Structure 1
Amino acid sequence: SLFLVGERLNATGSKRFREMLFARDLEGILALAREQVEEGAHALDLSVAWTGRDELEDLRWLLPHLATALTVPVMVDSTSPEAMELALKYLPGRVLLNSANLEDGLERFDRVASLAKAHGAALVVLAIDEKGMAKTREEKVRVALRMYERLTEHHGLRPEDLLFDLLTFPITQGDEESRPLAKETLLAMEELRERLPGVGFVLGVSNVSFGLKPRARRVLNSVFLDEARKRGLTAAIVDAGKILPISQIPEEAYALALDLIYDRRKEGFDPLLAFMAYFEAH
Structure 2
Amino acid sequence: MRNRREVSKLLSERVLLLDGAYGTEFMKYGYDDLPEELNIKAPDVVLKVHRSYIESGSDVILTNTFGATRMKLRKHGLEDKLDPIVRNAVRIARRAAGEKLVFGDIGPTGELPYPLGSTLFEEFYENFRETVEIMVEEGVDGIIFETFSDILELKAAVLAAREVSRDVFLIAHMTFDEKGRSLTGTDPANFAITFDELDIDALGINCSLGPEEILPIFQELSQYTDKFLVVEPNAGKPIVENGKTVYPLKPHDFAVHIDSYYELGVNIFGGCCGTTPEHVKLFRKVLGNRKPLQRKKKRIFAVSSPSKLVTFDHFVVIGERINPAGRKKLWAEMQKGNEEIVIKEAKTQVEKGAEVLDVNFGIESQIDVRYVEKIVQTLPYVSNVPLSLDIQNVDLTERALRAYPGRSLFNSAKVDEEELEMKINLLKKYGGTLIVLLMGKDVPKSFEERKEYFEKALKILERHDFSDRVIFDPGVLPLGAEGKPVEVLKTIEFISSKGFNTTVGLSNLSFGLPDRSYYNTAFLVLGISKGLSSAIMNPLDETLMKTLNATLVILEKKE
TM-score range, shorter chain: 0.7 to 0.9
Pairs within 5 Å for 1:1-282: 1-50=314-363, 53-54=366-367, 56-102=369-415, 105-130=416-441, 132-151=442-461, 153-159=462-468, 161-173=469-481, 178=482, 181-194=484-497, 196-197=498-499, 199-213=500-514, 216-242=515-541, 243-246=544-547
Residue 193 to residue 47, structure 1, CA distance change in 2 (3 Å):
same
Cα 1:220–1:113 shift into 2, 3 Å:
same
* Contact map agreement 2:495 2:502 (CA 8 A) in 1: no
- Conservation of the 8 A alpha-carbon contact between 1:45 and 1:237: yes
Counterpart in the other structure of 1:270: none
Confirm or deny: 8 A CA contact 1:48 1:58 kept in the other structure.
no
Aligned partner letter, 1:168: V
Amino acid at match of 1:238: M
What RMSD in Å do the two structures reach over aligned CA positions?
Answer: 2.2
Could you list the per-position Cα deviations for residues 213-256 of structure 1 after superposition, in whole angstroms to 9, with x for gaps in the alignment?
Answer: 3xx1111101101111111111100011212434999xxxxxxx
Shift of 1:202: 0.6
Equivalent position SS for 2:504: strand
Assess if the C-alpha contact under 8 Å between 1:223 and 1:246 holds in 2: no
AA matched with 2:423? V
Contact 1:125 1:164 in 2 (8 A): yes
Superposition deviation, residue 11 in structure 1: 1.6
Structure 2: which amino acid aligns with 1:164?
F
Paired amino acid for 2:488: T
**1:44 match: secondary structure:** strand
Question: In structure 2, how many angstroms separate the alpha carbons of the residues matched to 1:247 and 1:53?
Answer: 36
TM-score normalised by the chain length of structure 2? 0.40
- Give 1 or 2: higher helix fraction: 1
Maintained 8 Å contact 2:504/2:535: yes
> What do the CA deviations read for 1:81-133 (whole angstroms, capped 9, x no partner)?
1121111111111211111113xx41221111222233331100111124x11
Q: Looking at CA atoms only, which structure, 1 or 2, has the larger radius of gyration? A: 2
* Alpha-carbon distance, 1:150 to partner: 1.6
Aligned residue pairs total 235
Q: Which has the bigger relative contact order, CA under 8 A and spacing at least 6?
A: 1
CA 1:7/1:55 → structure 2, altered by over 3 Å: closer, same or farther?
Answer: farther
TM-score by length of 1: 0.77
Runs (5+) with no aligned partner, structure 2: 1-313, 551-559
Percent same amino acid among aligned pairs?
A: 27
Measured after TM superposition, the shift of residue 57 of structure 1 is 4.4
1:67, 1:90 within 8 Å by CA — same for their partners in 2? no
**Does the CA contact (< 8 Å) of 1:127 and 1:140 recur in 2?**
yes
Gaps of 5+ in 1: 250-282
